[model samples]
Target: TEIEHLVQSVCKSYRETCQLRLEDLLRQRSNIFSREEVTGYQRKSMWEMWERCAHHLTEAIQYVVEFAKRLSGFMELCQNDQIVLLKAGAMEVVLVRMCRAYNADNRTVFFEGKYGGMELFRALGCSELISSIFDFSHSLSALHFSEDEIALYTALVLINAHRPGLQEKRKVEQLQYNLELAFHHHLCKTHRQSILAKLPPKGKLRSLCSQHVERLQIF
Candidate 1:
């Protein structure tokens, strides 16, 4: 029973530690934007959008953690394969770290805009980043994003939207595959359907996006 006990202890510790750290950051949420405005910084509508987008991502993080926890528990019991354990462990770590990123300055700017900022830059950047997070998470349903996720994110943000070439368009192929896989991965591989049966009906993965939009309405 020692191995079982140890796994239980370590899993509990990891889960509690990460939850505490992330929740603390979530509580300290204050500055949503950069000190210097990049674009559309003055508009209320823009900030609202950022709020919704960030909140939605936060929801995704929470959902993934819950899903991974169940998967982790199952692996502990079944030991059917090491593969599931490893995947669940790695995904849990990634989701926990993502919470930190949401609280980090570099990523926070993607959600918040300040006054007297460039409207176009703020609007486009916020929308793109927000959408990208969803798209990226959705991709997780299929396979973990390797190097290509970072590359696709950079290209989408940096490439001239006004004058994109065929190469730029070609990138969509990878993005689409990743996104579809993400949804599939979450619902099928992660056992989201059965997990849903346990949790409240509204707590389903799809609502993660909509609930985010709802939060924005408050602010």
Candidate 2:
């Protein structure tokens, strides 16, 4: 159970530090932004759009960096490899991480403290992406993964060897293989089968990251 123990150690640190800290920041931003929407909803400008989403993404990435450091062997990848992996994978994992913050009952994502639907990002002028991201969140959340599974999956998301720009594909690949073995082992003992058959398109997250950059580029 050494592998499982490693899983627990990584997830435990995230829960106490990274995850809880994110929740606090989310609450703060939501409360701060919630009031702005009402005060001068129209005058908020494009900066609000970029800032809102960027702040969330920025917040999301720091936590991901923390997770990656705690991930075994990740630090072995050269500094440049580390930077590239993070650049390409950061937003992708952020998408994965966003699922937990999504509320299925109302089909809304909880950001900053606001519980609004896709319309929350409507004024951002990137409604298309807002819907796409939420759909991804909704579909993934429907699987009802346990917290440990989610933690493992998010870890795998960042460590994916298939990501472009990796200098040592074999190393990342091996690390990815390790996590999958650990992930499937955990799955066998807990959740009923279905995920293997129901997985999303491989390129979806990567492609979405492109859209993210594209929209932000024009914004």
Candidate 3:
């Protein structure tokens, strides 16, 4: 119970911070891609490939570190478990935050309004994976989720019960359970349909990666 209370308070505070960051990102409007650019990058140079991939990964690492710091006692987990959680959840977390930048008008995803694009993703043989991402993003945007809601969703993605290599699976599961309850409690007051209805199905993380494993070797 104490852990739950601590987690709740920490999440609430971090939610506020996340909201501010999302607002800042939206205002910057720099990561977006034009249709022409997206269609023409098929012959991307090696350096160009590395640059965009690095940008993508660098932003994700920032989120991983922010989450580790904001989740109160996350760092208290064993070093092995810390690595496990970060490695397992990094892409999921990145995908969740990308909702903030979803340009339904252009139907493109970007990194701080720059190089990342759906067409570039397709050229890398990730058409299905990118499609699933945009569909998820579309659903989330359609819900018009508030910053608080997005924060809770991100927390749920982070405190996954099923990540392998955890030193304390029971403790992690309990934590995940608490966050799930918090998420549902917020949803029950706000929407008739469950958030789960809108989220990617179970094994979403696995499925997203399994199809694009080679492309994601950059990770």
Candidate 4:
């Protein structure tokens, strides 16, 4: 019983902390953060944000396929303290590791190179999910984002998972090529210059990226 109560309290604190941090991060989007303008994507009403956040990603993802069986929209039921706590706790775990890894190594190469020695970019997925909480603000700042961020993250994850094309045939090579192109063109430019400069063995990376791009006809 004591342990249960402790867990509950910790979860509650996590919920509040994530809520606050999400709000703050949304508000603090920098001028340099990538931005985009898309019509008709904005929330329809004030209740929309609360509506969206009330459900778990699992629920939301499922809702897409199972549209008729929509979950309850009532914020009270959806915003159960326990659920908030759980989701927030999950978000914190992700944010912490992202920060820790960045700080511990703090190199673009560590982040950019063929996954962070993991079998998958699950950490990046975690961080992307966490960041999604503040999507509205990022939108306002023109820094439109989504789970797309995790694509590169997970591609890298998959690279390490399968030994950088050691296993499968064409898929790995395809992923690596697209991954580097994504890094050079999309991600690196959007992120800090130092991040781009951290490319491992500048000549090798550039050449590899060029060859792969040409091989794939990814002009």
- Judging by lDDT against the true structure, name the best candidate: 2
- lDDT of each candidate versus the true structure: 0.36, 0.72, 0.66, 0.29
Show the colliding residue pairs in model 2: 26-112, 30-112, 30-113
Candidate 2 lDDT over residue span 89-205, tens digit each: 878777787777776666776655655676656557677877888888899989877767777777777778876777788888888888887788787767645685665688888
TM-score, ranked from best to worst: 2, 3, 1, 4
Which candidate, 1 or 3, would have the higher lDDT against the true structure? 3
Models ranked on lDDT = 2, 3, 1, 4
List the lowest-lDDT window of 10 residues for candidate 2.
25-34
Cα lDDT tens digits, model 3, 117-176, are 566664454567668878878776776767657667777777886887888988788778
Shift of residue 136 alpha carbon in model 3, Å = 2.8
Go through the candidates in order and give the clash count of each: 11, 3, 5, 5
Model 4: CA > 4 A from native: 1-97, 100-151, 161-166, 187-193, 197-219
TM match of model 3 to true structure: 0.77
Using alpha carbons, what is the TM-score of model 2? 0.83
**What is the lDDT for 63 in model 4?**
22
TM-score of each: 0.26, 0.83, 0.77, 0.24
lDDT of 4 at 89: 30
lDDT of 1 by residue, 1-219 (tens): 433343344334344434334444555466344544443344446566566555654555454445334432222332322233333233333332343334232334223322111232344334554445444344332333322232222122212122223223334344334433433344464354443233213222223333333343454
Better of 2 and 3 by lDDT: 2
